[PDB]
């Protein structure tokens, strides 16, 4: 009956709705509800039947949990620390390190210390006096920690039954394995607990956004169908993961030359894979996280700050030629000073890390960036001199045809080796004779996403419909058509490579 016990949603009665919304602005989640929920509330056991029978070796390495926070709410922070204390075998926890990144909250100062000193696990509170990024706060917290494994968690998380033993067992099996739990969803509206799927892992798109993506078939075949064995994830979300401390040091920790705007998750994923380690989602380990739609904090220095510094650093250090897929869709990013990456290039040199192509081929063959392609650039009609343009539209919407601006971005397409017409993680799709040319999630299963570009006839033939791409019609003038092939110059297209 207690609010939220067992992951139950907390619905606020309408009498209070208004006040709730105001309280909602502080953390960009329902604070009114979180404060009704017990700091030790019960949650469901969400592990796959088959993880519950697993017996893990003894002498597993103790872990230090590093939780960094900036203006976290009292209830969420304390629920996180209680969730790790109460749901972790006591002998497997060295300590909890709470890193206060220059928080401006009364309860996060002396009250936090008074409360935490009364816990049965040693919980330390380290203070960044200057607003520092998550990178810097985590480096501080790890430098202070003593446990052989370092577990990073956000300050609005809730561990579940049996979350820790799988991670520590995987690390003891191989110290060069970096492990992430399955990140369950804790509703920012009701704080309802919802389990995440073991069939979803981490990748990225041409924009260098971290993205959730379906676990592909090869990964089920490798495990011969056993979902309880860890998944090799191309990328990590970044909020939650564990790593042996000495190996964390050996791979170069985080890029200390990065600013506060994020990106380290992709950088460290690329670094771990290319430099000889393994990154895994441990499917028997679950930990919930309050995903939010926007951040509740600003970053120091106002707005309009130069962003994509860290994306440039990671791309220039690790991504090789493929960095272009980012640069070409981001007009102007090539003039942002990304500082000094010398130590990072030298680290790549020391460890003889493999090329990004090896990563795309072996770790992420289902990548959104194509490892091989026939063209990257604009798709121009011979007759009307216009270019296809995704118009920033989302899945299931029509691709447009407009005047070529030559600035790249939303008029960039790639005729890939899989013979897709792709723009980031969308592919041109036709599912009806004369139908509209829509943009759907690329599925790597050809079919209606299969096109033939004749390099001499310059025709773009949709294979399953057997119709050619053609200029817009009078009734739908801002959209290309697909029509029985005619040999016209309106059905010819230039798919050239744009360079620097």
């Amino acid at each position: 009956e207690g609010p939220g016990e067992m992951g139950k949603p907390v619905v606020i009665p309408k009498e209070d709705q208004e006040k709730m919304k105001e309280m909602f602005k502080i953390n960009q989640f329902n604070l009114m509800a979180s404060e009704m929920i017990a700091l030790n509330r019960s949650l469901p056991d969400v592990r796959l039947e088959g993880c519950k029978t697993k017996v893990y070796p003894d002498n597993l390495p103790t872990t230090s949990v590093v939780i960094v926070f900036h203006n976290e709410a009292w209830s969420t922070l304390l629920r996180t620390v209680h969730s790790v204390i109460n749901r972790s075998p006591r002998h497997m926890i060295e300590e909890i390190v709470l890193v206060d990144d220059a928080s401006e909250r009364d309860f996060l100062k002396r009250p936090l210390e008074s409360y935490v000193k009364k816990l049965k696990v040693p919980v330390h509170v380290i203070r960044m006096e200057q607003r520092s990024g998550l990178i810097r706060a985590r480096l501080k917290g790890a430098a202070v920690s003593r446990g052989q494994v370092i577990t990073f968690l956000d300050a609005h998380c809730e561990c579940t039954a049996g979350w820790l033993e799988p991670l520590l067992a995987r690390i003891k099996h191989d110290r060069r394995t970096v492990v992430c739990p399955i990140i369950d969803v804790i509703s920012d509206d009701t704080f309802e607990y919802m389990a995440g799927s073991d069939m979803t892992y981490g990748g990225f798109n041409w924009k260098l956004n971290f993205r959730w993506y379906p676990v592909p078939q090869r990964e089920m075949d490798r495990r011969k169908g056993d979902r309880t064995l860890p998944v090799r994830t191309p990328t990590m979300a970044g909020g939650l993961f564990s790593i042996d401390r000495d190996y964390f040091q050996e791979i170069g920790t985080y890029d200390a030359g990065m600013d506060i705007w994020g990106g380290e998750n992709l950088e460290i994923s690329f670094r771990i894979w290319q430099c000889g380690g393994t990154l895994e989602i441990v499917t028997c380990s679950h930990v919930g996280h309050v995903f939010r739609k926007a951040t509740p904090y600003t970053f120091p220095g106002g707005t309009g700050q130069i962003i994509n510094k860290n994306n440039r650093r990671l791309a220039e250090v690790w991504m090789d030629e493929f960095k272009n897929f980012f640069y070409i869709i981001s007009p102007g990013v090539t003039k942002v000073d990304y500082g000094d990456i010398s130590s990072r290039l030298g680290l790549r040199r020391k460890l003889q890390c493999k090329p990004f192509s090896w990563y795309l081929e072996n770790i992420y063959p289902d990548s959104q960036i194509p490892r091989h392609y026939f063209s990257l650039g604009e798709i121009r009609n011979v007759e009307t001199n216009q270019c296809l343009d995704n118009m920033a539209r989302k899945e299931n919407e029509k691709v447009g045809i407009f005047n070529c601006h030559g600035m790249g971005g939303n008029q960039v397409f790639s005729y890939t080796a899989n013979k897709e017409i792709r723009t980031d993680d969308l592919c041109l799709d036709v599912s009806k004779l004369n139908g509209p040319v829509t943009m759907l999630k690329c599925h790597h299963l050809k079919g209606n996403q299969l096109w033939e570009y004749d390099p001499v006839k310059l025709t773009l033939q949709h294979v399953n419909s057997n119709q050619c791409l053609d200029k817009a019609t009078e009734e739908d003038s801002q959209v290309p058509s697909i029509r029985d092939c005619t040999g016209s110059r309106s059905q010819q297209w230039l798919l050239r490579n744009v360079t620097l």
Binding site: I329, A392, F402, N403, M407, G409, N410
Partner: peptide
């Protein structure tokens, strides 16, 4: 999304 500017 990237910089539009033009029609």
């Amino acid at each position: 999304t990237s910089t539009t500017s033009a029609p």
